[model samples]
Target: MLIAIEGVDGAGKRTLVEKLSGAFRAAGRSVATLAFPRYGQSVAADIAAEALHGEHGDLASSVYAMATLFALDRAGAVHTIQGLCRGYDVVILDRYVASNAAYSAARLHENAAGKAAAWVQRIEFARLGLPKPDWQVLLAVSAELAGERSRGRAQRDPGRARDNYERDAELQQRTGAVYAELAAQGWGGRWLVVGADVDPGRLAATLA
Candidate 1:
């Protein structure tokens, strides 16, 4: 099975993944986790790593570059994801297609799809044969709450500051709205929007 976790930064994605990993393991299912931008291994990851680590580009540039990178990387890994689906019961991606499209497109606004979104979909889906996700879990969070959480992360790791998308309330709102659109259109699998303000156990059980 293919499962993905989608949300803004500091939305408890990693925590949920931890919970699901334990639950899946206890149920005697084999699980492999993949986080996007895939960081070091994929081209998208390289851009993300540079943007986050180096000082070459702005947040918008990094977000756009990384979106294309992740899409390209996912396209390259289509066969591997499929093969893994055969061997493993579940392939859990910390972030996936929806993450890039929603966040990047919103940040880029009108130029979203026309510039990069469509190309990513065409190159990654048509050319590479990567299909839409089987299921997408959107960890929804409000702006105030997200800001509070992001502040904590910044306090913990100063280098890990919120980028343009994270800080831009408008883009963040649009990203959440797009996720709802995806669910309504059935594009990114069956979406389950869970609040980040709630208890983790409750959210996990609800999703389960």
Candidate 2:
């Protein structure tokens, strides 16, 4: 089983990964976890990470460029993802291919994946050979709450600074709309729309 946990940050992603990982282990199923853009693992990820942190002048401003850079990080390491899948009974990710779809749509004022979504699917999964997630988990949350948590985290931890995306209020709201749309459409594959009241153990039990 493969899962990509998508949606806003500060929405119990890491905790869910740990809970599921624990649950999978207790159930005697081997598990592996990875978060993308795979920061510090490759140059492509580094460039994208830096671009978002106000490093590249116009790079971050262009949605397509930013999206392509993120895709590059995964494309260059196509084997690592599938290899992990083969090596483990369950593989879970922090985020996956659909991020570009949501992000691009939010910027373009589209409620769902428009051309950018198809473009991402073709470039990343078809042309680049990146592994397609078997399931995606959308941590459904209000944009206001998402931003509030993100900002709170930034304040709590000085090291975990806010990126350009985190600072954009309207973008966060719009991106969330796209995320809901992606869940409804089952973008990529099977999707589970989880709200704030999710039961980790129960959900994890259903998963593997």
Candidate 3:
């Protein structure tokens, strides 16, 4: 099973991914995890990160450009992901294609059904041939909480400052809405909504 955990910045996705991995292992299922945009591993991801960090002169301002770069990062990781799927019973992703869709749509001032979202579907899944996740887990974190957590995270780690997207309160709210609509649509796979109120271990048990 290939599962993608998605949410706005600071939604505890990394923590959940680790907990879920432990749950699966405890349940006797071998699991492996990968996080996008693959960071230093992918050139596109590196460029996108630089742009988001206020480099590249207005590059991050272009919604589709950033989205395409993110897709490129995943496109290049397809082979690595496929190999992981073969080596393990379950593969969990920290973020995946839906992230591109929702973020782009939100930046464009559009909803989930908007053109940018459809374009992401075509470019990533159809054209780029990235695998569709068997499960897409949406961490239902409020924008307010996300902003607080992200900011707090930056303070705790001087090198880990919030990027352009993380600094935008309105964008986070819009992106959360778009994510909800995308989850409702269930395009790539069945979605599981996880809120802060739910225990990660308990949710992991169900998925396991």
Candidate 4:
């Protein structure tokens, strides 16, 4: 089973990935974990990161261009993702295609059923040939709270700078809402919406 944990920045996706990985292992399931963008490994992802941080010129300003960078990064890693899925009983990802769909749609002020969402689905999953998750879990934190957490993390980690997505409060709000809608619509696969009070252990048990 390939499970994806998706959320906006600071939505506790990493924490959930770690918890689920351990839980799956304890349940005697061989687990493999992957995170998207592969920042240090993929040139496309590196360029996207640089553009988001203002190092690249105007690349980040175009929604289509920025989204394509993220999609290409995953496209480049399709082989590795497929290999992991084939080798492991459970494959978990921090973020997946749903992220591209949500963020890009939100940037365009569109919902899951919007044209932007359709464009992303076609480009990322259909054309790019990235593996789709069997199930997706959304960490449904409020945009304000999620923003606060992201800002806090950035403060503590001097090396961690807020990207354009993380820095835009309105965009974060819209993106979070879009994610909720996608979860409701069950885009690509089954989805679980989780709130702040959610217990990772119980959730992990259920997923495993």
Candidate 5:
């Protein structure tokens, strides 16, 4: 089984994954978790990091470059994901195609029409050689709450302040709106809306 957790920054996706992984393992399920934008290992991750770091000249350039990098990253890891699924009873992905699509559309907005838009979908899934996750958990949370949570973290973990995207409230809102749309559409896989609450254990059971 393949399970994926998705949410905007500070929506608690990484924490959810970490906690859920533990819950599944404690329940006797052999789980392998893959965190997306796997920094350093993926071209996507590198470009994404650069985009977040304000390394590009403009938003458009950053969006395209980061999206392409994300696609390239997923393209390189598909085989290993499939292999793991075949061997393990359960596989969990911290981030997946939905993340790429949501962020690209949100970032590019009107400019994300036609080819640019198609490219995100293609690279995020089909062209990346990844099948849809069996279960997709959309951990929904309001922008205000996300910001508050992140701010709290930044207080403890200095240097973890808002990134380029997070600093822009409007962009973050658009990103969350896109995620809501995707979840509303309901794909084939099992899905759940993990609202503002931060209970990964409860979410793990329901998501599965």
Candidate 6:
């Protein structure tokens, strides 16, 4: 099974990834995990990060341009992702193509029906041909609480500052709503919606 856990920045996605992985392992299922941007390995991901931080001029301002960088980052890592899937009983992702769909849609001030969202689906899935996840899980959380968590994280790790997406409260709210609809609709395959306070142990039972 290939599952992707998604949410707005600071919705505790990485923590969930860790918890879920441990749960699966404890249950005797071999598990593998991957996170987007391949942050340090993929050149496209590095460029995208720089653009988000205002280092690349006008790059962040263009929605498709920025989205393409993110898509390409995943494209470059497709081989590794596929390999992991073939070897493990379960492959869990912290974020995947749905992320591009949600965040880019929010950037255009649009919803699931918006042009940017459609563009992302086409570019990342159809065009790039990245494997679609078997399940898309949304960690539903309020924008206000999400922002507070992000701020607290930045304080704990001074190097991890809030980027454009994290700083925009409205965008975060719109993105969260869009993610909810995507999960409800099962845009890709099966879908699961989890609350911020949901018990990980119970959540793990569902996956099994």
Which candidate wins on lDDT? 3
Tens digit of per-residue lDDT, candidate 4, span 1-208:
8899999999888988887788778778999998987889999999999898887888898999988998889988899989998899999998999998999999999999998789988888889888778889999998888899999999999889798889999999999999999999999789999877777678877787
* For every candidate, C-alpha RMSD to the true structure in Å: 3.4, 1.2, 1.1, 1.1, 2.8, 1.1
Residue 119, model 5: Cα distance from true site in angstroms = 3.6
Question: lDDT per residue, candidate 3, 1-208, as tens digits?
Answer: 8999999999989988888888888788899999998999999999999999999998898888899899999989989999998999999999999999999999999998899999998999999999999899999898999899999999999989999999999999999999999999996778989887767667767676
Model 1 lDDT tens row, 1-208: 7888887766778877887777777667788887776656776556555665445556436555667666777766787788887888777788887776677666666333344456556666667687666778877877567667877887889777776556667776777666666556555467777775555455444444
List model 2 lDDT by residue over 1-208, tens digit each. Answer: 8889888766767777887788778888899999887888978788888888889788888989988888988887678888889999999998889988888878878766488888888898899988778889888888888788889989989978888888988888888888999889988888898887787777787776
User: Model 4 scores what on Cα lDDT?
Assistant: 0.89
Residue range 151-182, candidate 6, lDDT tens digits: 99889998999888788889899999889877
The stretch of ten residues in a row with the least summed lDDT in candidate 6 is 196-205
The 10 consecutive residues of candidate 2 with the worst lDDT sum are: 8-17
lDDT (CA) for every model shown? 0.69, 0.84, 0.91, 0.89, 0.75, 0.87
TM-score for all models, in order of appearance: 0.80, 0.95, 0.97, 0.96, 0.85, 0.96
Off by over 4 Å in 3: none
Q: How good is model 5 by TM-score? A: 0.85
- Runs of candidate 6 with Cα error greater than 4 angstroms are none
Give the runs in model 4 whose Cα sits over 4 Å from its true position.
none
Clashes of 4: 0
Error of 4 at 199 (Å): 2.6
How are the candidates ranked when ordered by lDDT, highest leading? 3, 4, 6, 2, 5, 1
Clashing residue pairs in candidate 2 are: none
* Higher-scoring candidate on TM-score, 1 or 4: 4
Q: Which ten residues in a row have the lowest lDDT in candidate 1?
A: 110-119
